[PDB]
Automatic annotation (TrEMBL), chains E, F:
Pfam families membership: Me-amine-dh_H
InterPro entries found in the cross-reference section: MeN_DH_Hvc, Metamine_DH_Hvc, Quino_amine_DH_bsu, WD40/YVTN_repeat-like_dom_sf
Entry's family note: Belongs to the aromatic amine dehydrogenase heavy chain family.
Provenance organism: Paracoccus denitrificans (strain Pd 1222)
NCBIfam families: TTQ_MADH_Hv
EC id: 1.4.9.1
SUPFAM superfamilies for this protein: YVTN repeat-like/Quinoprotein amine dehydrogenase
Name of the featured protein: Methylamine dehydrogenase heavy chain
Example GO BP: methylamine metabolic process
Top EC class, one word: oxidoreductase
High-level lineage: Bacteria, Pseudomonadati, Pseudomonadota, Alphaproteobacteria, Rhodobacterales
Keyword Cytoplasm: no
The reaction(s) this protein catalyses: 2 oxidized [amicyanin] + methylamine + H2O = 2 reduced [amicyanin] + formaldehyde + NH4(+) + 2 H(+)
Amino acid sequence: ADDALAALGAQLFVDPALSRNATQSCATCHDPARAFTDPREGKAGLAVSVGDDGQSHGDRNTPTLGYAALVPAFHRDANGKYKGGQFWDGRADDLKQQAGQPMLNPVEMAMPDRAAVAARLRDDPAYRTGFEALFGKGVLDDPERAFDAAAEALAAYQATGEFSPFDSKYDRVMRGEEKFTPLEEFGYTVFITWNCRLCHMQRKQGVAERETFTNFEYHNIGLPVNETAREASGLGADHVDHGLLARPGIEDPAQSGRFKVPSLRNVAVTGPYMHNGVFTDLRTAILFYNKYTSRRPEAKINPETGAPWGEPEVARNLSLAELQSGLMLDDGRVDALVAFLETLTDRRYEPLLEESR
Amino acid sequence: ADDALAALGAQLFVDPALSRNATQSCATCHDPARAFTDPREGKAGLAVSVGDDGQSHGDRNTPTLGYAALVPAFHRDANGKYKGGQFWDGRADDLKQQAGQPMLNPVEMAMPDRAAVAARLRDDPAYRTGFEALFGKGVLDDPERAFDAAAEALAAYQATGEFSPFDSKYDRVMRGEEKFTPLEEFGYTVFITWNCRLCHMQRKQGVAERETFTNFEYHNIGLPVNETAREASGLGADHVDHGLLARPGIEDPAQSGRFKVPSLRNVAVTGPYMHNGVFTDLRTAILFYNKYTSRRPEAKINPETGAPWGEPEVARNLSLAELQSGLMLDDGRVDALVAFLETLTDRRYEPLLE
Amino acid sequence: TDPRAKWVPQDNDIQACDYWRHCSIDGNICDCSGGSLTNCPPGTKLATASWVASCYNPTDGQSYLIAYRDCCGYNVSGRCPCLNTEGELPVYRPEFANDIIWCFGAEDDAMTYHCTISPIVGKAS
Amino acid sequence: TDPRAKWVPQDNDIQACDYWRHCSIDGNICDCSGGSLTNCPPGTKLATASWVASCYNPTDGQSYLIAYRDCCGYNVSGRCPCLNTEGELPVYRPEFANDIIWCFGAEDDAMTYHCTISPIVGKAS
Amino acid sequence: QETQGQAAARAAAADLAAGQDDEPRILEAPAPDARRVYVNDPAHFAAVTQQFVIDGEAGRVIGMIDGGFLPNPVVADDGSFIAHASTVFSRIARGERTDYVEVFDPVTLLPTADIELPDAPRFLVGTYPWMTSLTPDGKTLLFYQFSPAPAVGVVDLEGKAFKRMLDVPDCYHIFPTAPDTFFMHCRDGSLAKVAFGTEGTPEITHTEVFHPEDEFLINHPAYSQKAGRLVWPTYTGKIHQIDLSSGDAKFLPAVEALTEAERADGWRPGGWQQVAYHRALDRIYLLVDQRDEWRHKTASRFVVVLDAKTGERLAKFEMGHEIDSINVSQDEKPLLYALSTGDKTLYIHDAESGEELRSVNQLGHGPQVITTADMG
Amino acid sequence: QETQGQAAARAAAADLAAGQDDEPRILEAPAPDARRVYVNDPAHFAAVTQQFVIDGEAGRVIGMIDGGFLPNPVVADDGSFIAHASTVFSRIARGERTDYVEVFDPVTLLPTADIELPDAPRFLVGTYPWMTSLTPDGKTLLFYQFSPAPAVGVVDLEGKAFKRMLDVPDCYHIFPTAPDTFFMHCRDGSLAKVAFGTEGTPEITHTEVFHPEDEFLINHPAYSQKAGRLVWPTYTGKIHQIDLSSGDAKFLPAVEALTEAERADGWRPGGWQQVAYHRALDRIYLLVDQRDEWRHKTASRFVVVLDAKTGERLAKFEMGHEIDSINVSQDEKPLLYALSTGDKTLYIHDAESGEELRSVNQLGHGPQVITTADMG
Ligand code: HEC
Ligand code: HEC
Ligand code: HEC
Ligand code: HEC
Ligand SMILES: [Ca+2]
Ligand SMILES: [Ca+2]
Ligand code: NA
Ligand code: NA
Ligand code: NA
């Protein structure tokens, strides 16, 4: 049951037959060899992914599916902070509500509708067997049921130990099985004493049982537009990615430009970074934060382009109170954080850590 | 000897033969019946006195001679403040140097010269015997010796207990012989805790042996010209009384407009007040010190005139640090002060208080 | 009470200088001026910087990372002063140095020292 | 050292609260902050206002008027604090009142209280 | 018996054990209530000072407010704000003086107004609660000025502006009776009634002299603005009661706090705030001990409580500590607050019985003034 | 034998008897000398603080200087002036911050300069002497800034103006050695030499690492500017001596202030200013006591005096009080100054015998820092 449903999702996950032209599965964009992110080059490098039509580019970077199972369903907490959900703008409530979206998205897998997806499933005798044993006879004949059933199988598959093994050096260090290097231990200390802990730690205080390095909140850190991605996506030179405000039901103008805080697990191997894939290097993503803190001119320069970071896409509702910590990260502390963030890489991707350091 | 000297001075003091027309003696202006000041009405009221000649008026108020013998000889002290001397601008060093100046002043006694003074002394058999017994035979033949010996007799006379009897109600209270009235004691308290005691006390601290309510210093308290007195003086509308700066040898501009802190003894009976008799009432004099402290409209007005006090004759070197105390005297304290001042009247002038 | 004796943490009174979470506090316990173990008093501004320490919790036998944080913008409370230095390192290792006025990121640029809070932020390693 | 007992003036130590001239002093003895019995410490500004008291001198059995003068424009010294109240009247009798900060007339409009001197201004009565 | 700190350790242990998360933040003070008490520490004339906001019930500090040199605290009886007239200098104790009024939100303690007072006009003196006062409608703050002469400043808290100074005669203290009226105490032993409109000299009316030259009235009378009752002890414990509830001064029967034998044996009031008045209970509280005539500012070990009507002693408490100031909550079953400058501690007593309930120590350097709101 | 207040009573008595008159006035402090000592009181982080100017020979307070929040005192070695970098806010501890440097005349104690520091650039930390420092010619004041990053501010005391901030590596403290050069201690365990002009990137040079990552160097090293000797104890009483007199760091041999048996028996340094250095005697004084290793800021009761050259112990003094900070006069037959933050008292010892000679008490609320001028 919990075994079988996941097993069926394992199969759907790698099945390109869920795309219009049968070129693309979840695995194509969310590649298990790359911590469930897209190794493919498109017109905006690795910043955005190309759909089943071989031509359409999305407008946001493909996020890891590792540890996405730990994110709570979307909600507004009592302090009026929105939390949780899936997609960078929280517009899906949870894994299951998210799973059908790639399938119907003409920019992604591009099936025309539920009926077309059902007809695909119905063609494979193994799905008729697998789906019917879990959901009942004729499930594959009801396109709504079939589509919901697939979403649920795929959500269950992402909740297995294999998406979230907690077997990074950090996990091993938190068990006492090993120690951090001096560089990593200092990086860890910085992380917990600087402003990063205000956003990239499950809890405000106390100890998380399964830390995934995000509070699941939404913050506008004042990222510029990724021009080449935005051009590839075709959304227009006047388009504004409103972040969370794009979630249907969110009306509050103070939510414009806020994106879900991402889990920093596997961050070392899931470049490029931010919701639009704007920065290539991990160090760049960390150096961004100095722009709120440092008085040095270099702090306002994106080291990857040599030009200013850029005007924020949405110049309002910046998280200035967390961002403007009054303290700049020197290069010792940036190296220390890079070393720390690398300890967050799952055991199986430890070998990818070499071709980036 | 000190006795006979004083007794000689006593004769000279009321002798009008030391004036040009023989119409005037020291006692004429320093009337012993008026605490040694001038009862006589002139062009400018009692602000200034008339000389021997009948028309010449001074430009200063004739001060009391009581307690003047307690003033130290003129000197600059180690902290740089001039102290002591005689006249309102301290231009005389002591009582001896002062004595002769009225005799020779044309706007006062108007003797031509020391010779004419000696000649007048030679006419009186009583003077030949008096002077000769103290300064030796022929003293009156020599005008320098005569005039100086007359000045010595005058000075000795003014140094007698008669000019400084210390018998005011103030002195009797300090000797435990009587009490102040509640108001007098309030006045005394006010006097010693407010700025007055910064200038009108012999000492900065401790107990003075013969207090005369002056520290003998020179201060410009910013007084306006007495317009009628100045016009009567005939010294002109252009004239500036520079106070201490006028003493020969004082060259320091910080002293312009500074006058000697009078002793407050007998102050109740020697009006009008200040170096130029500008204020007729004692009360007015006390209120003047509110111009520096009170915010109220009433404080800018001379109550005697109903008009603003006027610009200081010398608009610099005001003793601002002492005068801008931060505190205004209310009616209650101004009353208290009058009461206290009145207790500084000598016994024999107690009758003069109305 | 022997100031020189090894510090003995207790888990039963947060207002005493031997409360286990105060093992590297310097200043005043915010609970004593209107705050709480982990909140600032009214009118003061909560800093975002902190210094840490690993404090042994004698209730559970576990050591915890305590990230101190100052309540800023008021004169020093003067109540419940305490100074501990367990694992406290000199100023050149400022993430463990506690003489520094950790008021950075406080609202209104508040930098005056009022008192300090002792929230846990991790398990120690 | 019994604070309600009648005050016992001594003439042997000016830094003590029972020194005879301090019979209506309120604040701090200027002599303990670099002044002397009758002079202000450096940096302070001497006020022209005073409150007066008559203080019994055990040594000559005479009573002296003491006009207290404040030395102003510094935070209070904290040294040799003394509060005595011989003949001290309420505020509406300010000449004898000593809660008042007697700094009127001080240079630079200095009004903050640092300490108080005790000069004699005359014999009492 | 468990202390506030120990309960706090247990809640904290349990949250950690339950894995309960909570956000570090700025607390709000609990809503103002009858049991709130404010201790002002003038700090023996230090150039800056503190006010302690205390929950009287719990014996807990719930906030603090900083002030400058000898600030005058005021508390709106209705509990809607607190304020003070305070004084700072550009270089600690020296340089440019700014006198100002600040109004505070009584739960966030944030300032809601900051009103400059022109020309440095505050009276700088050991804190007398009634040298600055709120009018009944909380719309106006009146502060006393001594220099150059007695005067009273009129501060509009509604428009957040200073208005003008009122010229007065030789008088002291300010007891507001109305939006435009307050009484002061004069050197001649009269009270003065001051009625200020918007413009011109106010209109000043003296009462009859109500005490002699040599009856001496303390610097800290109790005054209940809501009850119109000015309670005024003299050095010997003679207590003048003036009723001002009509708009004009009605003099009550003068009463005595110690007995002729106590007075004979050297019982005298003494301390700072020597007297409290409970409005509903109609009850005077007075700090006394055995003392010399001129030890009238020293701490007392005993409190006497008398009926305001009759003048009968209702209790005598041995406070068990050196007490300089007292006050009471204005609720029924009131606390009696006993502040020791020396111990820097507020001892909170049951006012009916005098037993020590709890205390708050470490209240500054030399705390002196206790204030409470009269909220009902 | 006779105390200072007894000598004063006697002499006033005699002045009174002789009718001796004196003008009440503002005293001048006696000329600064070798035995003048300054005690700064950080007042446990109060927003306002005091320095006490003390004649160590008489043990007499001769002056005070007010300051704001955690000021850094400096004293020119030649006695010509004293100064501090200080911080004030517009509303006591809140509002607009103004950092500034004041220079004072050492006799009148009057400020002769008030130099604003723009953009509130001061490092707010418990007072470390060597976080604000005079260049040797007295013309420049250098102050450390931590936020947003380590920097040093350059203040021109002769022209009375702020000059600039200098960017530095991850380093701490400022030991000036020249009008335009200072050293800092870096996180990586080296010293950095900073040489700076009116404009341009400072020349920054690192020495070699002189201590392992696990040897901890205290926040209060002694630095004699005239000897260029930086005396840096570690937590264990291991002393680093760095000779900077050639203008470059030369590493002297380490000495152990405590013996191995003493260290085996838990002796370690502890307190605030744990170490002093007498230049003329080339002697190190360390505060030491038996203590657990993490009680390194507690007071100590013993001073060991060791020859800086050989490491030989010359004395171990039982101080007889809880001492947080020591310093010595730099004259022949030096005083050892032993300040108790607990007792708020400066104890003055003969540095040779360790004998206590006199003491000055009531030095504020939490006095911590002793500064002497080196005038020889
Ligand atoms: C490339 C065209 C993709 C394929 C095929 C699939 N996904 Fe995807 N995924 C893609 C992008 C570009 C994004 C972010 C877009 C945005 O609007 O934010 C995503 C996001 C998800 C998420 C949410 C993760 C998070 O918020 O952290 C999940 C759970 C997810 N993707 C899973 C998923 C499944 C189950 C798929 C096949 C059915 C699948 N993806 C296909 C890009 C692409
Ligand atoms: C809330 C104010 C935050 C603070 C403080 C920090 N981070 Fe952050 N981070 C935050 C958000 C909302 C996002 C996504 C922003 C977007 O719109 O895309 C991020 C992203 C990162 C990343 C990239 C992660 C990824 O793309 O998968 C890194 C490496 C990262 N953050 C690190 C980081 C560090 C090291 C910080 C302290 C210096 C830090 N963040 C502060 C929210 C916030
Ligand atoms: C009216 C014409 C006078 C006659 C006759 C005498 N004096 Fe006089 N006296 C007079 C005035 C206007 C002044 C002050 C003038 C000035 O320049 O300030 C004086 C002053 C003195 C003083 C000094 C008093 C003091 O400073 O307190 C002395 C000692 C004095 N006068 C004595 C004096 C003697 C001895 C006379 C007979 C020769 C004499 N005066 C005549 C007015 C008149
Ligand atoms: C020095 C700064 C003084 C202070 C303060 C006070 N007084 Fe004064 N007083 C002073 C001088 C120099 C003079 C003469 C001024 C002049 O130019 O004529 C005076 C004068 C008086 C008088 C007139 C007395 C007379 O014989 O004419 C009175 C009554 C008087 N002063 C009283 C007085 C009081 C009561 C003060 C406190 C309010 C006071 N003075 C202050 C010098 C100074
Ligand atoms: Ca990515
Ligand atoms: Ca006259
Ligand atoms: Na790009
Ligand atoms: Na929306
Ligand atoms: Na001249």
